[model samples]
Target: AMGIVIEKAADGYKLSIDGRETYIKGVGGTYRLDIAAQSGANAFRTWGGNVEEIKKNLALASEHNMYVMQGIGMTKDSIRYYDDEYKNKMREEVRLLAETFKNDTSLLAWGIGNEIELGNANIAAAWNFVEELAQLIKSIDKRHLVSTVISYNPSALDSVAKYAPSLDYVGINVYGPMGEVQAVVDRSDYKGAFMITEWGPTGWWETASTEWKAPIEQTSEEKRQVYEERYTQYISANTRCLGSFVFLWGQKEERTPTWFSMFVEDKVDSLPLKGEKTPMVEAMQRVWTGKELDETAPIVRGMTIDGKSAIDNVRIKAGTLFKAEVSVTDKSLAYVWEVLKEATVLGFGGSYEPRPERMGDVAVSDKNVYETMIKVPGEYRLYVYVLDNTGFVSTANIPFQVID
Candidate 1:
């Protein structure tokens, strides 16, 4: 009885649950539903997982009075769609999902797949399978909506317009400036509602790279500014936009431990409490709830090594000590520094990559100054973390090369 209806409005579209208009203020992970709700997020999405995990996430969402956009896993290798056996197996799995959760009140919509078209040579086959699955899910459930996520690909949007008639809307995952989203959608023939499925800081690919081609990451304070600006300019102001889900409410090891993660992982404690909140979280809270945080995260202005910044292309000789210091707005905050080898194994489209090993012992001369020396000739990063007594932290890093 508590089914959501997608109504095409005069300007855009409207989503209503039991006649109550619902705007999705959503996050992209299943962790810390309570904290998300407290911060004014109304929903969360899963990228695909086991049935038990799905059920647990659903229960947690229900407990927090939030909704869910359940992601169904599909193979990224688009050629798999050509296999009849794979199609049959996926159909059965989808059927099970629909039959199992169709009646649940917390169910918002079925996210058919996440970026299934990324790097796939066979685009037509991939979309055909997606359209097939969307139709299949709709026929079986007839209650919730269905959507598939794509990484800001216009051709894919055009394909969705041409092929996937059963999809109620498309989900666009973008990083950096979202000013292009409206124009891209306008150019497409698909005149439908959409949500930003994953968005946060400017991605690693979008930022500056060192001479060695290592991407420069933004400090937590800088990322907070980005979150506020993007949300205000693109998401909240755009009438054509239905809603959005901020990326990775939890921690993840991507290019670095802190690149996309909103929380710092504590090795000794559980999350939502032990994990320190980044300034990006505060930015979201202020934007979503329209209130200021009781305690603010420390602000990191800049970081430099040997009196030279990251853009200076600072190169140091191996076995020579260099001084690194981070400029912050406050001096009383505790500081922790680390030296890590530049990550060699890189991945695209949120692929898995191992964290680079910590290179050497780093000692802080002062609260925010670190002294270290690299023994080998390689690319490395100096990371500085400033934390308060409360669970809040700011992060910044500078990449450098060691030469013989």
Candidate 2:
């Protein structure tokens, strides 16, 4: 029978899948499994979807010869953890999931929950529930490993050490500086196997804020550098780390449309093949496989509006012509510029949020420079997407306030 096993090693731990040592080169999100597999990722994670979605993801993973850390979606509400009724319902769900997919070779481990400790005051009770669920899954399925995902919260790790002893390992989702993760784990009592289940560019909350409080997003080029540095300096260097999963292999409407997404949105319904890849994707490929593609994504050196960068706290009067210029590796690459109202309906912990409305498009003149006028007085961002003909793109945005 094929199985997933955790072996205690002198340095840390080693993961064995069907008697073969497997280091998880994983990515978060389900779509574009083919691209992820081609880019040298060996596994993928989901934050727990419906039954059909899980089945589809498993099939897709099998197709790509990749493993999956299937998430179980724990509730963040502390009150729910204390309720016996809710616990029982979740138990039934876990039993069904385990009994159904226990034999699937694509199943790597049961990721019991994702960031469940984030806002819950009663950490003890919540992690106790996590322990209970992990125990229940272990009881039903002996072929797979069981674990839970959390933010880089040392206090929570302490709770896991105190309460959730059944967990085979712990999954940590981190952003910004990953070096702190090594220190935090060393300080925690829960010295166990772990994975960087979700990591990427500097998060919206971690980045610098504009004067009016909107966070400044890094360009795709800058983000690529960040990914490479974090992987080399922190993630791969940690022996205790079984491996890691880069965040958001696909697109989503986070703080911005491109904030955490590795792929540009498939606007023309051309996916898997024609979908525009970003510089972050190329960087991951280079790190994971130690190889480079013939044609790389465009590199955005910088973008400026009215001769000032995003740090300039650009303020423009309504109806004034502002010149925007984006310097990139290739000036002949196609440039698509747009102005969008700053997003207000924000969601926390990767919850769904709608993209801000696009005010209008800025017409490009000299391939990389454009002149545009904002007529309305409000908070807005000027965006430039540099597209290479080989289905890859680079993006940057500058936030400005239009005054009357």
lDDT of 2: 0.85
Q: Model 2 compared with the native: what TM-score?
A: 0.89
The number of residue pairs in model 1 that clash at the backbone is 0
**Estimated TM-score per prediction?**
0.88, 0.89
lDDT of 2 by residue, 135-228 (tens): 8888889999999888888887888899999999999988667768888998999978899998887888878888999899999989999889
Please report, in order, the local distance difference test score of every candidate based on alpha carbons: 0.84, 0.85
Top candidate when judged by TM-score against the true structure: 2
Q: Which number leads on lDDT?
A: 2
Q: lDDT tens string, model 1, 73-158? A: 88977778889999999999998998888788888999988887775673788888889999888888877889999888888788
Clashing residue pairs, backbone N/CA/C < 3 A, model 2: none
